[PDB]
Amino acid sequence: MQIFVKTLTGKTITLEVEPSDTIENVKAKIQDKEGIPPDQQRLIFAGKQLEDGRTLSDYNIQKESTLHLVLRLRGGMQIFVKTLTGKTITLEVEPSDTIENVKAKIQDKEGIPPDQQRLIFAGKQLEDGRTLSDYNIQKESTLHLVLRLR
């Protein structure tokens, strides 16, 4: 069974699928062909957004049907840093950022040298060479800043 997937830019691709294919597997086929990861895909059929856990047959999608693809470009992650003056700082980060680069981001915002910063999360001091992901720090987590000198 062929189906078509069309973008707003006019590009159309063809996929071979079965009525039993999940929306999830359709997005993976699109990734294999075009390099677009599933979280960057929004599929529409008959004016409705399709959900990952349902099948083409759940939506009555048949041979020669056309699906609409609109990419979802919303990358980025933010965390908060709270000081003892009560100030809250917002930072743009990646899960792979080291604590070192996070302290540089605070320096760019507040002028505080990294060697004068101590960061605390979950009641523990964070070491410079580990990453946010290493410490299970998620989006919109809050860290505590305390200033100390050699």
Binding site: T7, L8, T9, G35, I36, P37, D39, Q40, R42, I44, A46, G47, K48, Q49, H68, V70, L71, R72, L73, R74, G75, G76, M77, Q78, T90, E92, E94, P95, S96, T98, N101, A104, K105, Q107, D108, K109, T131, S133, D134, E140
Partner: protein, 228 residues
């Protein structure tokens, strides 16, 4: 192995030599930075007198609105307000994708699931600003292999801005004129603005300052939107 390349050596390279370093080494690992350090990337920075160019829109907390920030940063003004952006996006979904008004309402209010693409941006620029655009991945430009810098310059032509979309799974470290690295993350829009000295300034709403880089520094898999 790039660990022994110095900032000074990188500064002595041409635009294409610097761009080859980006396309070979700037992609981050899963849980680590790329193979280029902040000091190495600093070697790619030209001028630091960024005073006529501004980041008009910084990224707001919680909002996948980089498509709107990239437009305003490209045009150097508050061209598209938040409500205008959400309202025109909703029109496209209902008029062209046949979505019902109740479902359009959920798409607009669902902040965590919101996001749009280069086709939506092209439609907004045409409808609201009567500005037609073209787009291409940098790697698909003709004779890109003979010179990335020349191919991008040729495609951009006389335009004074471009919008860049990083579609794919990769996060690219990029030059920064400050203390920290501000990478080009996956699924994101940024812009570049050209000044009267023919210098290009990279504007990430998730960054701190404009930075002057060669066009060949844009990672080659990114999609370029260019006004006609």
């Amino acid at each position: 192995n790039p660990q022994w390349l110095t900032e000074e050596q990188i500064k002595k390279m041409s635009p294409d030599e610097q761009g080859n370093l980006i396309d070979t080494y700037a992609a981050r690992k899963i849980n680590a930075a790329s193979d280029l350090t902040h000091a190495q990337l600093r070697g790619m920075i030209g001028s630091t007198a960024a005073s006529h160019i501004a980041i008009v829109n910084a990224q707001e907390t919680g909002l996948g609105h980089a498509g709107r920030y990239a437009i305003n940063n490209a045009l150097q003004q508050e061209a598209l307000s938040q409500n205008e952006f959400l309202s025109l996006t909703g029109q496209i979904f209902s008029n062209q994708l046949g979505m019902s008004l109740a479902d359009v309402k959920n798409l607009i209010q669902n902040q965590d699931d919101f996001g749009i693409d280069t086709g939506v941006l092209a439609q907004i620029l045409k409808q609201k600003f009567n500005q037609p655009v073209k787009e291409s991945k940098i790697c698909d430009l003709p004779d890109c292999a003979l010179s990335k810098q020349q191919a991008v310059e040729n495609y951009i032509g006389k335009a004074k801005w471009v919008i860049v979309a990083n579609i794919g799974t990769e996060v690219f470290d990029m030059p920064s004129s400050t203390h920290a690295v501000y990478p080009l993350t996956r699924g994101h829009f940024v812009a570049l603005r050209r000044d009267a000295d023919n210098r290009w300034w990279y504007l990430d709403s998730r960054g701190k300052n404009p930075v002057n880089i060669a066009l060949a520094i844009i990672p080659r898999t990114c999609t370029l939107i260019v006004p006609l």
